[PDB]
Paper text:
[name] of an influenza virus is a multifunctional virulence factor that antagonizes the host’s innate immune response and is associated with many strain-specific functions in viral replication and host range. To this end, we selected four NS1s of human IAV strains that emerged between 1918 and 2004: 1918 H1N1, Puerto Rico 8 (PR8) H1N1, Udorn (Ud) H3N2, and Vietnam (VN) H5N1.
To reveal the mechanistic bases of long-range epistasis and how strain-specific mutations reshaped the energy landscape of [name] during evolution, we first examined the structure of the [name]:p85β complexes. The structure of the [name]:p85β complex was available for 1918 and PR8 NS1s23,35, and we determined a new crystal structure of VN [name] bound to p85β in this study. Given the structural invariance of the complexes, we hypothesized that the structure and dynamics of [name] in the unbound state are most likely responsible for the strain-specific epistasis and thermodynamic signature for binding. Notably, the kon value was highly similar in all four NS1s, including 1918 [name], showing that strain-specific mutations across the NS1s have a near-neutral effect on the p85β-binding rate constant. Indeed, PR8 and VN NS1s underwent the BI-BC dynamics on a sub-ms timescale. The analysis of slow-exchanging residues on the NMR timescale revealed that the population of the BC-like conformer was ~99% for PR8 and VN NS1s and ~90% for 1918 [name]. Overall, core interface residues showed positive epistatic interactions with strain-specific mutations between 1918 and 1972, indicating that the binding interface mutations have less deleterious effects on kon values of NS1s of later IAV strains. This trend reversed between 1972 and 2004, with large negative epistasis.
Numbering used by the authors:
A (entry chain D): 433 to 499, 521 to 597
B (entry chain A): 81 to 206
C (entry chain B): 81 to 199
D (entry chain C): 433 to 495, 532 to 597
Write the structure that this text describes.
């Protein structure tokens, strides 16, 4: 009756806020797992292209030690293919780094609403607790 | 990050105002009072609220004024209830603006309101 | 920056507790309950609260826990009453700490409280 | 006798909060004036030192040693006064959060009292008109 109806309504609003926070944090967990996965992939690709860089540094040092026919000309073509493959691998690496930055953007766009929802959920819980709502009713409103 | 904007003055927030046809609705823990006896007017919405991360966070008080300064509407957090979110304030602004436009009233929002939590488009001219 | 820090979980916040000798103070709009029946105990304060500018801004809830895990004190915002400032919480925490110390109880606070609230 | 008692207590608390706000505001303004004053003083001293060592160095390309000691004392004065001004800046930097929070809390208490049935005269009474 009035004063009890208002407490029950605040409990319903706590349920709403808690479900909203659950959804937002679920989305954030999805994005965070994706971010960690793509970061590990970026590290792998960095290591691969770094090995390529080492091999091509050997190539520089061995190309400066020459200064015909086909003893060397047969290599200086497939090795240019290896150069092109290195630069293509990096074209993929930076393309993935862009998507990783966009994922970070989407996560940082969620952090404010996430923190606000968590704080207001805890505040509604504290209010209901101060109005005499036992832990069983609080868990009813939360869900589990 | 983290600022506190105030479109209204202490006198404007503390000023008494009377509703001829009181229309009081509730959006979340926010109360939206409006005088539906107002018609064919141009109304400006002035609000004091705190912002964080360039988003509206907590509404301190919103009020609606005519050109001559009279108050015709208000959005305020209820005293006995806990706080609210920015989406609650946006919904409250939307409800107030829709209810006001339903009576041939030209609602306009301030620049600070139009930045963070804003609604409204345009009315004709009565 | 701005960060909402939490020492307690949902269960610790919603948990039911009792006071055999309830002593209560009201500092501003903050209620400080404690059990005067607690003597010669080790008690830890846990708090959920917001922080802006590396400063305590708003307390959501603080509760005192024995080493076993029984809630014997609480600092909470009073419902249906306006808010508070950081200095209000800073004083209420000291009030609770002194009330616990009078009963020969040693009080410790979490690493979170010691950075933004201290004693 | 109960609800009115709570309203009156919240009104006295609004009195206290308005007092805190208008005290820390006086403090912050007193410090801002001093910050600008010492800033302009050090600004003048910078160009004074400029002219000092400018005359010391330019007219030395050909071939009056007390001007060196004058520049020494001026550098020392500017150093100490800059330390003092930076301390003033550090002091008034930690008042802006408290000022913003106090203003927001005072306005929130005002709105709470307004919704509980406090007229403009009562609010001005708790606000010192």
């Amino acid at each position: 009756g009035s004063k009890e109806d208002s407490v029950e309504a605040v409990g319903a609003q706590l349920k709403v806020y808690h479900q909203q926070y659950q959804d937002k944090s679920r989305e954030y967990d999805q994005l965070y797992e994706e971010y960690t996965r793509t970061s590990q992939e970026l590290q792998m690709k960095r290591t691969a292209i770094e090995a390529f860089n080492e091999t091509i540094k050997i190539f520089e040092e061995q190309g400066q030690t020459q200064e015909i026919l086909l003893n060397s000309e047969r290599l200086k073509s497939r090795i240019a293919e290896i150069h092109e493959s290195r630069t293509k691998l990096e074209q993929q690496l930076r393309a993935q780094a862009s998507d990783n930055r966009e994922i970070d953007k989407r996560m940082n766009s969620l952090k404010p609403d996430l923190m606000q929802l968590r704080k207001i959920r805890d505040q509604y819980l504290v209010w209901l607790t101060q109005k005499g709502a036992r832990q069983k009713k609080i868990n009813e409103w939360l869900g589990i | 990050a983290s600022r506190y904007l105030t479109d209204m003055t202490l006198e404007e927030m503390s000023r008494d105002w009377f509703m001829l046809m009181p229309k009081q609705k509730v959006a979340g823990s926010l109360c939206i009072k409006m005088d539906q006896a107002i018609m064919d007017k141009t109304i400006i919405l002035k609000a004091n609220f705190s912002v964080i991360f360039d988003r509206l966070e907590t509404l301190i008080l919103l009020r609606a004024f005519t050109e001559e300064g009279a108050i015709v509407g208000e959005i305020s957090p209820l005293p006995s209830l806990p706080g609210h979110t920015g989406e609650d304030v946006k919904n409250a602004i939307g409800v107030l603006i829709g209810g006001l436009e339903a009576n041939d009233n030209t609602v306009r929002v301030t620049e600070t309101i139009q930045r963070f939590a804003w609604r409204n488009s345009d009315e004709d001219g009565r």
